[PDB]
Design goal:
This is part of a larger assembly, with chains A (69 residues), B (440 residues) and C (421 residues).
Chain A: H1 2-64
Chain B: E1 4-9, H1 10-28, E2 53-55, E3 61-63, E4 65-69, H2 73-80, E5 92-94, H3 103-109, H4 115-127, E6 134-140, H5 144-161, E7 165-172, H6 183-194, E8 200-205, H7 206-217, H8 224-243, H9 252-259, E9 269-273, H10 278-281, H11 288-295, E10 312-321, H12 325-338, E11 352-356, E12 373-381, H13 385-399, H14 405-409, H15 415-436
Parallel strand pairs in B: 1-4, 1-6, 4-5, 6-7, 7-8, 10-11
Antiparallel strand pairs in B: 2-3, 9-12, 10-12
Chain C: E1 4-9, H1 10-27, H2 42-45, E2 51-53, E3 59-61, E4 63-67, H3 71-77, E5 90-92, H4 101-105, H5 108-125, E6 132-138, H6 143-158, E7 163-170, H7 181-195, E8 198-203, H8 204-214, H9 222-241, H10 250-257, E9 265-271, H11 276-283, E10 300-309, H12 313-325, E11 339-344, E12 353-361, H13 365-379, H14 386-389, H15 395-417
Parallel strand pairs in C: 1-4, 1-6, 4-5, 6-7, 7-8, 8-9, 10-11
Antiparallel strand pairs in C: 2-3, 9-12, 10-12
Helix pairs in contact in C: 1-3, 1-6, 1-9, 5-6, 6-7, 7-13, 7-15, 8-9, 11-12, 13-15
Classes of the chains: A mainly alpha (69), B alpha/beta (440), C alpha/beta (421).
The structure holds guanosine-5'-triphosphate, guanosine-5'-diphosphate, 4-[(4-methylphenyl)methyl]-1,4-thiazinane 1,1-dioxide and magnesium ion (MG) (2 copies).
Guanosine-5'-triphosphate (GTP) is lined by residues 10-12, 15-16, 69-70, 98-101, 140, 142-146, 171, 173, 177-179, 183, 206, 224, 227-228, 231 of chain B.
């Protein structure tokens, strides 16, 4: 009966520690997945705006090649 | 010993916190400067009110509370208001840019910048406790901070304090005073996220409180101030067992044993009475029988739903004021005769009663009449799932078109979190159906 | 606080921009010298949203004046409230734009954009917590239309997570006879669909009709048309600059108004142009819209309403519920509670009560169909394209802009016909 009493309290401790551990890991996974997603969305936006500048340059360039000077 | 730390998150949580702590100070004789002339314990003590107030050597009684919001304007009113001297400045935490009604910004983009400061401040309150019992978290469902930041905070508190009990007071959204179209989204997301991290949550339906103010107090267009003072009375009733003691006082945690039959089924329905104007109180003295009968009138419920369409798994009556068991027993005998209160077949049908003799209190300038006796009933009824159903239906209407979903995805969230959270709600509705089915 | 940086480009942009600052300055008790002499502390509560506080309790609009010609900005500097603006925030060229979107976007407009960004960067750098920018301009000219969208793109590159908001004046043959305005407008809409979060469609077609048919102005001038624009701009910004619960900042307004990122073009309205029922019915009337569209030809995705002045909030609530219940057919069922109502006790100048309407309705496709109709009438015959190809552009950019705006229309129609079941 003493060894069963030990196993119960050890199980209670293990259940608390495991609740902490699982919560810590889920949150860390959500935190990391969210940082990647948001940063990736900003990268796509800026990349589009970069293609705009690239395009504006090949337009100003296109006006040069229309010269008969 | 037995200290409770209160955490008020976002506008709704903070303004409800203003009302609650004002009412606490009046119930205990604490002045706006924190002095409590009746307390001969200078600098400390083990009084029942010390569960909610610490004491300084200068005689200051300070709420064991943290106020946090992602923008400053609401908490700034606390900093400059009537009770500005009640809180240490480090208990009032604010950012500069709020969550814009976006769970993702409160849980991630903005909340992550201040979560560590918040946990550090909570840790300083915890370190002052000799036997911390748990937390009380006040927040709206619909706001970006009340939903997103509360969820993050609840998750982090589970990590930092383990099995320590965490209760919620959650403001369920109503159209008459709602501020965002996406509030059904934020409600489902925070309910899904925090479900594992609270062992008891009291939902307060803003529409229910709105109707009670209009009907019972003759207030044409109730304001948050009207709503919050009524809410504070219900909060006061529930925490009165922790803050006062007495022969007939029953600790809230003992009601909790009866109220929560399974971890997920932890959303009690609260009913408060009497809610009466001063004009009417001048004519009528409401007896124990009258206020008890009012608890079973659906119009006095904190959440709109029909308990007749569900089954009871628990029923607790929290009395305060001039109330003796004899009157309670008689009133209860009548109610069981007149009202069919259907219990599930697997739990006892006896009402659990507590009595706090300290009479109810009201704040000057309020609309509630001061009565000699009041009661808060806390029941665990399957009918509270109807509130989930209404919220889930609005969620489904918008989500089928992915309306507004880009605001969340743009902040780092994925559609899988929406469907995962919605599936959890469907499972919760199913769980509430299963617990009500008879045994065979 | 929560600062907004204001920018006005081109003739139309600076014209309505100046009127806007005149009107709100009067509301906030700021005089032409930038001193406060109001009466209500609610005027200064959120003053920092639009104003900086200089030395001596002086309030300077956080405004940047841009144009490729000096003319319009000179008359602003000589206007009534001309001395209130920061002299260093006038950024202008000399060559002008010649009503050419290509010049304002790729050529002369691009040679002046960096000096504008220097001033933008200087204003933003001194903000406690910048929330975004608002731009005033026309879509029919060249500077505000071409260079205005250029500034949006360049600004969005340096402030990608801030809110970009524009007041865009749509062209109409009833007001301006310039033949290329359908080209400039479509090229601008092409940009606004991608790079702005919320756009108020200020339609010169509707402004004229209001002045002529409602106000009885046989010969509407730009001053007459601009009285409506400033009254409207005052209304739609009341929540941003007065203590309020609903739609109190640019982002929260966007979250309540924009269910899909491309459908962010708003139909603004105003009333009167008197009881709460009358105010509410008038603000929802097609004749009170600043966009030449009938909301009864489509459906509302979202609506924002703001009532100004002293009035019964119980009555407002009833009338707002009544107008929704009796017109439920015109509100999409799959967005519940999509109409939000704010109230501000401070009325506009001269009126005791006022109501401002901001609608995200699929009926706004009528505005874009009108522009597309004028556009293709010239493009299918490749008329006047040399003004733009001579600056480096090719027919491909026109084709893409046409299909994007045509796609916008079909997307509005898609959600108009969508059903809950
Ligand atoms: N009962 C009650 N409800 C409130 C109060 N303040 C806000 N609400 C409700 O809370 C919801 C809006 O959430 P808020 O708490 O205001 O927003 P928040 O938590 O500050 O989140 P963000 O502002 O987006 O950062 C709406 O349903 C409001 O009706 C209040 O003082 N009392
Ligand atoms: N409502 C209004 N519209 C204007 C005003 N000035 C110009 N517009 C319109 O704007 C278009 C011309 O664009 P403009 O502002 O001159 O271009 P820009 O100055 O080169 O950037 C025409 O369709 C005009 O009807 C004004 O003060 N008010
Ligand atoms: C030993 C043990 C018991 C229960 C729990 C789970 N419980 C979730 C609800 S709570 O966050 O309020 C308190 C903890 C964990 C460990
Ligand atoms: Mg807030
Ligand atoms: Mg012009």
């Amino acid at each position: 009966k003493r060894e069963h009493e030990r196993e119960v309290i050890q199980k209670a401790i293990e259940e608390n520690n495991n609740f902490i551990k699982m919560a810590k890991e889920k949150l860390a996974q959500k935190m990391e997945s969210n940082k990647e997603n948001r940063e990736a969305h900003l990268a796509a936006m800026l990349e589009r705006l970069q293609e705009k500048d690239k395009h504006a340059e090949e337009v100003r360039k296109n006006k040069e090649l229309k010269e008969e000077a | 010993m037995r200290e409770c730390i209160s955490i008020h998150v976002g506008q709704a949580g903070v303004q409800i916190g203003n009302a609650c702590w004002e009412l606490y100070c009046l119930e205990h004789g604490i002045q706006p400067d924190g002095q409590m002339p009746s307390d001969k314990t200078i600098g400390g003590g083990d009084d029942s009110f010390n569960t909610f107030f610490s004491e300084t050597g200068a005689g200051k009684h300070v709420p064991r509370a943290v106020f946090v919001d992602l923008e400053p304007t609401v908490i700034d009113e606390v900093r400059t208001g009537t009770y500005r001297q009640l809180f240490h400045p480090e208990q009032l935490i604010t950012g500069k840019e709020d969550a814009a009604n976006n769970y993702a910004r409160g849980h991630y983009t903005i909340g992550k910048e201040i979560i560590d400061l918040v946990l550090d401040r909570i840790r300083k309150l915890a370190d002052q406790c000799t036997g911390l019992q748990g937390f009380l978290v006040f927040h709206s469902f619909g706001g970006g901070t009340g939903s997103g930041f509360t969820s993050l905070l609840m998750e982090r508190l589970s990590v930092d304090y383990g099995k320590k009990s965490k209760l919620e007071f959650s403001i369920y959204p109503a159209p008459q005073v709602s501020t965002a179209v996406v509030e059904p989204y934020n409600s489902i997301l925070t309910t899904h996220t925090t479900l594992e991290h609270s062992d008891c949550a009291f939902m307060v339906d803003n529409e229910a409180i709105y109707d009670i103010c209009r009907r019972n107090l003759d207030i044409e267009r109730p304001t948050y101030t009207n709503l919050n003072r009524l809410i504070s009375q219900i909060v006061s009733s529930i925490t009165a067992s922790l803050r006062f003691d007495g022969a007939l006082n029953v600790d809230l945690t003992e009601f909790q044993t009866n109220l929560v039959p399974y971890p997920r089924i932890h959303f009690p329905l609260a009913t408060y009475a009497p809610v009466i104007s001063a004009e009417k109180a001048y004519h009528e003295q409401l007896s124990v029988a009258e206020i008890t009968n009012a608890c079973f009138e659906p119009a006095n419920q904190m959440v709109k739903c029909d308990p007749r369409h569900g089954k009871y798994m628990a029923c607790c009556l929290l009395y305060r004021g001039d109330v003796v068991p004899k009157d309670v027993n008689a009133a209860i005998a009548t109610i069981k005769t007149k009202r069919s209160i259907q219990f599930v077949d697997w739990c006892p049908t006896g009402f659990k009663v507590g009595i706090n003799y300290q009479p109810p209190t009201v704040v000057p300038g309020g609309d509630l009449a001061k009565v000699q006796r009041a009661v808060c009933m806390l029941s665990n009824t399957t009918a509270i799932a109807e509130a989930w159903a209404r919220l889930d239906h609005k969620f489904d209407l918008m989500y089928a078109k992915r309306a507004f979903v880009h605001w969340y995805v743009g902040e780092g969230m994925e559609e899988g979190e929406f469907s995962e959270a919605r599936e959890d709600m469907a499972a919760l509705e199913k769980d509430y159906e299963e617990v009500g089915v008879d045994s065979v | 606080m929560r600062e907004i940086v204001h920018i006005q480009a081109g003739q139309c942009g600076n014209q309505i921009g100046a009127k806007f600052w005149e009107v709100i300055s009067d509301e906030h008790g700021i005089d032409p010298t930038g001193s406060y002499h109001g009466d209500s502390d609610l005027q200064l509560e959120r003053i920092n949203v639009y104003y900086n506080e200089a030395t001596g309790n002086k309030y300077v609009p956080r405004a940047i004046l841009v144009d490729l010609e000096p003319g319009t900005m000179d008359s602003v500097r000589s206007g009534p409230f001309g001395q209130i603006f920061r002299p260093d925030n006038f950024v202008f060229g000399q060559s002008g734009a010649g009503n050419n979107w290509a010049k304002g976007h790729y050529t002369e407009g691009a040679e002046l954009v960096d000096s504008v960004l220097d001033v933008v960067r200087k204003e933003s750098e001194s903000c406690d917590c910048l929330q975004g920018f608002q731009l005033t301009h026309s879509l029919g000219g060249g500077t505000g239309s071409g260079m205005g969208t250029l500034l949006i793109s360049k600004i969005r590159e340096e402030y990608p997570d801030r809110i970009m908001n524009t007041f865009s004046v749509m062209p109409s043959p009833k007001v301006s006879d310039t033949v290329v305005e359908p080209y400039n407008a479509t090229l601008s809409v092409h940009q606004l669909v991608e790079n702005t979060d919320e756009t108020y469609c200020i339609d010169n077609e509707a402004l004229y009709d209001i002045c002529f048919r409602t106000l009885k102005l046989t010969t509407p001038t730009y001053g007459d048309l601009n009285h409506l624009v400033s009254a409207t701009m005052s209304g739609v910004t009341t929540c941003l600059r007065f203590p309020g619960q609903l739609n109190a900042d640019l982002r929260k307004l966007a979250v309540n108004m924009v269910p899909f990122p491309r459908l962010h073009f708003f139909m603004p309205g105003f009333a009167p142009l008197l009881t709460v029922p009358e105010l509410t019915q008038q603000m929802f009337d097609s004749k009170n819209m600043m966009a030449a569209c009938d909301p009864r030809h489509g459906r509302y995705l979202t609506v924002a309403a703001i009532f100004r002045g002293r009035m019964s909030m119980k009555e407002v609530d009833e009338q707002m519920l009544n107008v929704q219940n009796k017109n439920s057919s015109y509100f999409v069922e799959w967005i519940p509670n999509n109409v939000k109502t704010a109230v501000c006790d401070i009325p506009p100048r001269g009126l005791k009560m006022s109501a401002t309407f901001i609608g995200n309705s699929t009926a706004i496709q009528e505005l874009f169909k009108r522009i597309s109709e004028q556009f293709t009438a010239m493009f299918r015959r490749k008329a006047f394209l040399h003004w733009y190809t001579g600056e480096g552009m090719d027919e491909m950019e026109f084709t893409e802009a046409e299909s994007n705006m045509n796609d916008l229309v079909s997307e509005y129609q898609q959600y108009q016909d969508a059903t809950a079941d």
